Amino acid sequence: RIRALPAAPGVAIAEGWQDATLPLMEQVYQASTLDPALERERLTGALEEAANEFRRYSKRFAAGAQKETAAIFDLYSHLLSDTRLRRELFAEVDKGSVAEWAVKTVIEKFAEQFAALSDNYLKERAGDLRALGQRLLFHLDDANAWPERFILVADELSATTLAELPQDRLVGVVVRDGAANSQAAIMVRALGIPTVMGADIQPSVLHRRTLIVDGYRGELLVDPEPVLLQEYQRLISE
């Protein structure tokens, strides 16, 4: 029973999973390819899958969870389907690069340019571009180190972290340092994922343990089965 902050409503029970590894962007390295036609075909597949993914999310978000995020996800689905973006990626393939490095090269080049701007509303969107790159790399890896169902435990939560996670398996999130008004908190509410924040917690300890995350009341339960069996044997003697 760890008291904590309700960031997104819902209830979930699953094994805790800590991703203490580097993000997908930072573990891509420059790799040579002798098959230019294939790497271009792998890129058009990921761009279309990611654009389709953003297409349904904005279609779903329009009902209830945010109209703002439905609009932002709508614009990014158009950015993902823009041929100028694909030509930027094909230009790196013609240099003899694999699709993963081509995504890392283009995204970081444009994220750097956005971070250098003085316009306030464009400056802060440099992180969104890295998240889109993280999602692009997510669909390249699909040609399963996660549990069947898990609750994400972490010290920080950002858009880049959620972008390298499968939705079907992610049923809850527990953050030790966070702000319930951050961009990541806005996304989990839009996606309907129970989420708790500001929780005195050690992500390295909740790993590989069954957890119950309660986003309505801001409660986290570690190891519910002993507590259940104790109450059950209590009623038997009653």
Side-chain angles (χ1 to χ4, degrees):
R1 303 188 172 171
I2 283 77
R3 181 180 309 181
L5 207 167
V11 182
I13 178 174
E15 151 195 359
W17 189 74
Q18 176 201 27
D19 180 36
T21 81
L22 284 170
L24 267 42
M25 288 287 297
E26 297 191 22
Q27 66 190 42
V28 169
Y29 57 89
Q30 180 159 206
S32 47
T33 178
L34 297 174
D35 194 342
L38 169 63
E39 299 303 328
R40 285 188 288 264
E41 289 172 356
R42 297 177 56 211
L43 274 165
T44 54
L47 291 173
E48 177 166 77
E49 286 172 335
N52 280 310
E53 194 177 41
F54 274 69
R55 218 171 278 118
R56 352 279 243 94
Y57 276 154
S58 53
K59 173 198 58 189
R60 285 171 37 191
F61 295 159
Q66 281 280 106
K67 271 268 160 54
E68 309 162 332
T69 66
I72 300 185
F73 264 67
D74 186 41
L75 293 179
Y76 287 155
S77 59
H78 292 144
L79 176 66
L80 281 170
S81 51
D82 198 285
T83 61
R84 285 169 293 183
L85 172 65
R86 191 249 298 175
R87 297 186 68 176
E88 292 293 81
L89 298 163
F90 279 11
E92 291 295 327
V93 180
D94 297 341
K95 297 178 179 179
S97 302
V98 191
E100 284 77 6
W101 176 257
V103 170
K104 179 176 184 173
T105 301
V106 170
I107 270 70
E108 294 193 356
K109 169 160 125 291
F110 283 108
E112 274 154 26
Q113 293 175 20
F114 275 64
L117 301 182
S118 60
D119 303 325
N120 300 329
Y121 287 103
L122 272 181
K123 204 179 197 125
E124 332 292 336
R125 293 305 162 99
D128 297 24
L129 272 301
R130 301 193 183 277
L132 265 62
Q134 286 269 104
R135 200 61 187 172
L136 254 44
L137 298 177
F138 180 80
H139 296 108
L140 292 175
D141 215 315
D142 289 31
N144 65 116
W146 311 287
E148 194 179 61
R149 297 293 198 273
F150 62 91
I151 295 170
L152 172 64
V153 288
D155 53 338
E156 300 266 8
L157 187 60
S158 61
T160 60
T161 303
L162 297 166
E164 46 180 308
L165 298 178
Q167 169 181 84
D168 53 314
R169 301 189 150 114
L170 180 64
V171 302
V173 184
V174 177
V175 203
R176 178 198 209 252
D177 311 329
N181 73 326
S182 65
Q183 181 189 212
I186 297 183
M187 294 180 68
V188 291
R189 284 190 289 267
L191 294 166
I193 308 178
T195 295
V196 78
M197 291 181 176
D200 294 341
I201 247 114
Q202 293 175 334
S204 50
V205 175
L206 296 197
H207 186 58
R208 305 162 188 149
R209 285 210 203 179
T210 299
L211 311 171
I212 300 184
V213 49
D214 175 21
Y216 296 115
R217 306 171 184 176
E219 306 169 355
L220 178 73
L221 298 181
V222 189
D223 301 315
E225 184 187 64
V227 182
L228 176 65
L229 300 162
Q230 257 184 16
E231 173 65 25
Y232 170 70
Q233 90 167 77
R234 189 196 75 86
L235 293 155
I236 295 184
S237 68
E238 197 292 273

